[PDB]
Symmetry: D3
Subunit: 250 residues, 6 copies
């Protein structure tokens, strides 16, 4: 193996340059399946890697696990192996009342509520998605008919306090984050997730194309924790779009 964590070699990718990077390792095969010649490459820690084929070209699907740090690992090592375009596909909670469960969100840039982005660029550097990628995602989403929102995302190092969830063991939120969701709401931020800040920053600052898309599985103006019932029906929606977007980016 050529890299410390992913257990992959440059040869495994077969000249692949684009990677779809889901968070959950169980979604990896699920995504690979949407393409041709799906092959499992490796599985170590939270990192599961498949190769597949898109219009006759090699494509990598690789999980990041939850959060900046492990994302920063998968991205770095995939880059070492030759990946130049990263498309993230996620699940998110919307914080605007007009965004519905099932809606697809394309992120233009992220509020940096993470730590890892700082290890790549100072806070003043914009966690902005690549223009070609965003265009690919926005268009892909149009062509499959999904009801889509394009905007800024709050990308947090936690699932609980940083997203101002109170229904927690301690039931307090550090002062810094108290009332933070209302502020993000006022600034028109669409949603919370946990990886885009690191992903987008580290790519934007190292000449790597990144895009970010997610399916809404809970609206925060209503609940803190999603219901299981239509979580999978929304997943299948955004996956379709990211694969299509990838097609457009090859």
């Amino acid at each position: 193996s050529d890299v410390f964590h992913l257990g992959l070699t440059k040869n495994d990718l077969q000249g692949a340059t684009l990677a779809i990077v889901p968070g959950d390792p169980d979604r990896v095969e699920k995504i690979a399946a949407l393409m041709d010649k799906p092959v499992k490459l490796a599985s170590h820690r939270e990192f599961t890697t498949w190769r597949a084929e898109l219009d006759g070209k090699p494509v990598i699907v690789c999980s990041t696990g939850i959060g900046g740090p492990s994302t920063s690992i998968a991205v770095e090592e995939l880059a070492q192996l030759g990946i130049r375009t990263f498309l993230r596909i996620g699940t998110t909670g919307a914080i605007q009342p007009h965004i519905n469960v099932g809606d697809v969100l394309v992120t233009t840039a992220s509020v940096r509520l993470d730590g890892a982005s700082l290890h790549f660029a100072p806070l003043e550097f914009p966690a902005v998605a690549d223009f070609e990628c965003t265009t690919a995602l926005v268009e892909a989403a149009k062509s499959i008919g999904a009801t889509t929102h394009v905007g800024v995302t709050a990308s947090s190092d936690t699932f609980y306090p940083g997203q101002e969830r109170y229904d927690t063991y301690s039931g307090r939120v550090v002062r810094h984050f108290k009332g933070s969701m209302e502020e993000w709401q006022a600034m028109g931020v669409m949603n919370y997730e946990m990886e885009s800040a690191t992903l987008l920053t580290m790519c934007a600052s190292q000449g790597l194309r990144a895009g970010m898309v997610a399916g809404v599985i809970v609206n925060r103006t209503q609940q803190e924790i999603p219901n299981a019932e239509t979580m999978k029906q929304t997943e299948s929606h955004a996956v379709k779009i990211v694969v299509e977007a990838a097609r457009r980016l090859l």
Copy 2:
């Protein structure tokens, strides 16, 4: 007059909702002329305002003067008067060796080296341009054939130390900014200018559409101060694009 600085009334705009916002007040008529029925509306301090018509729809051209603060005034007050889309047209110095004098730069987001953005959103908020505006600019620039670069811009509160110019009265640059240009260069930042950070941040955080385009008049890998000779030939290039982008956004 309805606003403190601009000396305009909601009636002057005639239902206009888009504004082209150049920095130099002398470029205002220059731009307005490219359109139909150009009329001077007002001129106070650095703020010169003209109205014109684009495909039969009222459009404002309004100067911001140099820097975040006065920009933040022009934008605020134009918003009060009903403007919802802001297109900035500027001049810039490129910091990448492959970007040439005469090239047109479309900004996706900005490195926040300003003060005013902070008065609208904390530093972690992305100074990101509106997706429709950027698309309009990128496309406009393609249709007029201009050689174009799309990416991140360093937006600085100073023309001298913050852009690491040393040929200055004191000839020193505060520690914070020493070697800063090399760092921005490595992160692929295209250029320095002085208003995009404020403009984009205040718009992105208040539900206002903003776009940013500039003409390159100096390459910093070569000189600190531009030559006068082809400065006007590049201005005329980006102006053409911003007006055309505006057409697309009406």
Copy 3:
């Protein structure tokens, strides 16, 4: 021309070493007129420059436009041309209930709510006015009988949120500045304006003498936006003082 923005040559100044720097370019001639042999030198962007004579010595009047950035340009380039003493004359909103419209404020040092000052010195460096200049201003104000307050000023990169004005397009103030006016009030800050922080910091940290005086045209405990009626009667007051202070500093 010898400098990039002002369009002036070292020869234009005729050995001048002091500059009166108003914010509004229309106030430039107005001030120059109070002196002998007033001559227009240049006008580019927000920068209008006149030369005049005070007690047989050359004096420059030059506008900065609104805010740190452009101020930082005018100051730098005037320094390049040989100016060593800068006297700013401005308009301001008082935040203490005992300071009245018409009163003259002499600033000893500023609260740094700007960006540009940071490009000259870290935040811990005091935005402090030159002792000789302050003394000149305080005394000049005494001799013309004006009712004067001496103290700290809050110098903000915005006119709106940073001065906690709420009667704005969005009507919200970023968390950082919420209740900020009350705090400045409690700390005895006299007033808000937009340039002194940059001006004082960049001068104090580069061996240049700077002083700062302004006329009060609105009290914030009463209104957010000034009335037009006695705005000009107060301007004429502070102008008289700055010119007299200049006489004392030659």
Copy 4:
């Protein structure tokens, strides 16, 4: 299931109050096996949970995945389910030349180079391990004869730039972290890892006992990336200690 991520119910824990939390999900069973009645409870994303018995008392083993964010999830949800003591067992790189591969490190407190800790307490709050836990670890390590070092750990949101690794895709380290390893070395920091800062801070600030122990698998004064050969022999060492320390904490 009672929690959003782990897929566990309060009933599954059977009144357990202590959890051993390794990072790699494959180490989970490995650790559970060292105890009585090992049972797999759940496996979702990077979170694998086993229950086992220690001196006739229920104990949880649960993986965190790499980094603060996912750790912060595992800990929160285990706390919801009733866990009050958390013992981390990890792998680390030593940065002091006297610490050898194979050595066991007990962490008293951590240098907060992470993002998640901030979501629990401001930076000034010490990322300090619980005194009872530390004592348990230190003593456990003494009784099994391991050669042990007790001290401060640098806990980083990245594996690469934040640990000043240069043998990377871009081969640059953001200015902030340049020469950072030498600084940590001089301050006597033992090692780099990625979770302790979040773990310790969130526990210390929410009345939860936490301890942190790791096995050294590379010395950074020598290499950047570990060799595979004795990586497993060191893992088995620290695991023995954490289980023993757990015994002492029941």
Copy 5:
């Protein structure tokens, strides 16, 4: 004399390597008296130094005065003279309702609300006490029967606003600290004092052993200012413990 402030020579210490460091110079002899062969060495500014003997070994008692800065002097210069272990004995105000006047607090680590610690290590470095010293203190306290609490301390550069005391000349607390005590309470911080942050940080980052113990003389859930009546009875309690802890550390 060998050091600038303490007025001591390496010879005065007679090979002493441990120092008990009270804050009040009048407590110095009081402490020295509890040991054998008490001798006054020097008294300059707030720094009073005595030598005594513990189990036939030389021990220094030396006052720090109130606060980080002077503590940082005493510690530095004692280290120059060869002291390697520093035990601080203090007085403190508890902020938890269950901690009583008379209770003894052993500090594991400190919330850094000081300035001097920053001069030794960045804020992310933990202000953590030495493990051996803490153990010595905890055990010493057990053996003399005192009712003891072990945990984190808030260490503040002020006695008044930084500890959110309002019964002051101005009766306001700067925004930063408003409601800060409640937050520290919620995070389980035991108490306020003024030196541990500097002491612990400077020692932890320079390979010097430090410990911290204090007597509670006021509970902040009840009063702001202590009563004089049982202040001395509590002092005598913690002193006994620190001397005993020293015995264990020789």
Copy 6:
């Protein structure tokens, strides 16, 4: 007694409103002696207080000890007892080559390298001396013929690293302060001392008049540690000035 630390009552001051505040408690009587009817009031910890008479009016002399914290105590409690004007008299190390041992420095404002100032006002607030006080000091110094420099002072929470002294136990200076003295030098900062930042900030933000004067006892371009020989001859110089300045402020 009316205050927690100083051991004074409002009655002891006898309607005094001005205080001279030296750092060293042994300098207190020395200063009081220069005036009429010198009486010792109290001595607790580093706080020694004398009353004397100046032109038939009561004046307090009170020591602060070294550093912000204890200064912040003395000042607070003196204010509670009715003091409104504080004159600090100190010793300092010059960092400019043209300032000589024996020279007197009057401080207009301070670089905030302390912690306590933050407990009174955010960093952006200027640590500026009161205009009347500075004028009194400057004039007093003129009238006794002393060779005087007026300007900004760097006020540090440490004597050693924060003033970039390297001849120390560890011989390293935390990154933050590496090369800091050169930077302060370039910005024209005159000197290092340890109390002015706290003193000036807490007074300027609470409507209390403060002034700051010090004698130079070492030039840092030459040595790190002063020589004892002419240390007292310089002390006697600045003391004379502060007493005179006080006369002018009654």
